Amino acid sequence: GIDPFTFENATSDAINQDMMLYIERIAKIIQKLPKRVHINVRGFTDDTPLFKSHYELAANRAYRVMKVLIQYGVNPNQLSFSSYGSTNPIAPNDSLENRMKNNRVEIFFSTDANDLSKIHSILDNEFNP
Amino acid sequence: GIDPFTFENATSDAINQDMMLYIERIAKIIQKLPKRVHINVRGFTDDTPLVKTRFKSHYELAANRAYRVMKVLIQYGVNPNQLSFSSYGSTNPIAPNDSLENRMKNNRVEIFFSTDANDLSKIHSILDNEFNPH
């Protein structure tokens, strides 16, 4: 299914060419969804020491991804972004591997139950050969 | 006292030079505020039916207005963590949509501050210092 947008280094909001292409793919998918469906782009970090806060770094990540989605044709009306800083990690900040996991941006869908079926179907088909 | 960013007509999302200069003043003030104060950049339209535009609803036009203003604030150094944008479409007009000149007033972006009661005083002072200097 949809993987989060991972960031290569703990302290950067830079998006490499591979994630740029993956954001483009998701943008195109988003434009197939019902118009009443909105997308919240959520930014997170690990607890790597530092940007004057992890909220700032997360916000930049999320904002940048949102900007890329709009560049590739997602309607701004459907979009928002949010920063979660170093909170709500995918995994404890134990290892290199777990920390790297936590530096990411995730897509949340806002949908009624009818459109939820339609998103589900589109995503199930998009990511299953 | 502090005016909205008013757009040129019912369908424009263009930010002209006068508006860039005004957005820059607001970016300046934002960077002086307490870190706990956040800013919501709100976009609006009149209720004129959309013609000669790209732009399938007033919500989409209002969103691009607000988004574009927000991008400019960030260009001028406002921290994205303190920012969001919201589209209100043709809702919550400032003027009745009864005449052409009143409708034109509704095509705007407004800056909302999110603040606790203690920081509110600091914001007021900062706004005063910028927009009523002496």
Side-chain angles (χ1 to χ4, degrees), chain B residues 97-109:
Chain B
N97 281 117
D98 57 14
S99 87
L100 173 51
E101 299 80 23
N102 281 156
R103 285 202 288 289
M104 288 174 75
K105 289 276 90 215
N106 292 326
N107 295 299
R108 88 273 177 204
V109 163

Side-chain angles (χ1 to χ4, degrees), chain B residues 14-51 53-104:
Chain B
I15 296 174
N16 69 11
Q17 276 195 285
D18 277 350
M19 197 188 288
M20 287 293 289
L21 278 164
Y22 186 19
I23 295 167
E24 182 180 311
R25 293 187 79 171
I26 294 292
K28 179 183 175 192
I29 285 340
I30 293 168
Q31 296 177 74
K32 294 181 188 282
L33 303 182
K35 292 178 302 281
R36 284 169 58 251
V37 172
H38 288 214
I39 298 289
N40 179 236
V41 179
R42 298 191 178 181
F44 309 82
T45 71
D46 62 34
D47 70 353
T48 73
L50 291 167
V51 60
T53 190
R54 80 172 153 93
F55 268 164
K56 298 189 176 198
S57 69
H58 290 99
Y59 283 108
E60 297 162 36
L61 170 59
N64 211 216
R65 288 173 171 164
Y67 170 63
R68 285 176 39 86
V69 166
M70 194 190 68
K71 288 208 288 180
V72 179
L73 291 163
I74 291 164
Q75 291 183 286
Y76 284 127
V78 177
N79 284 337
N81 192 57
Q82 278 173 294
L83 282 165
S84 64
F85 77 97
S86 299
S87 175
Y88 285 75
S90 58
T91 75
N92 298 282
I94 51 196
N97 281 117
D98 57 14
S99 87
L100 173 51
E101 299 80 23
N102 281 156
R103 285 202 288 289
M104 288 174 75

Side-chain angles (χ1 to χ4, degrees), chain A residues 111-123:
Chain A
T111 184
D112 74 13
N114 293 344
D115 290 341
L116 189 145
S117 296
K118 292 171 169 193
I119 299 159
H120 170 72
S121 179
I122 288 172
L123 299 182

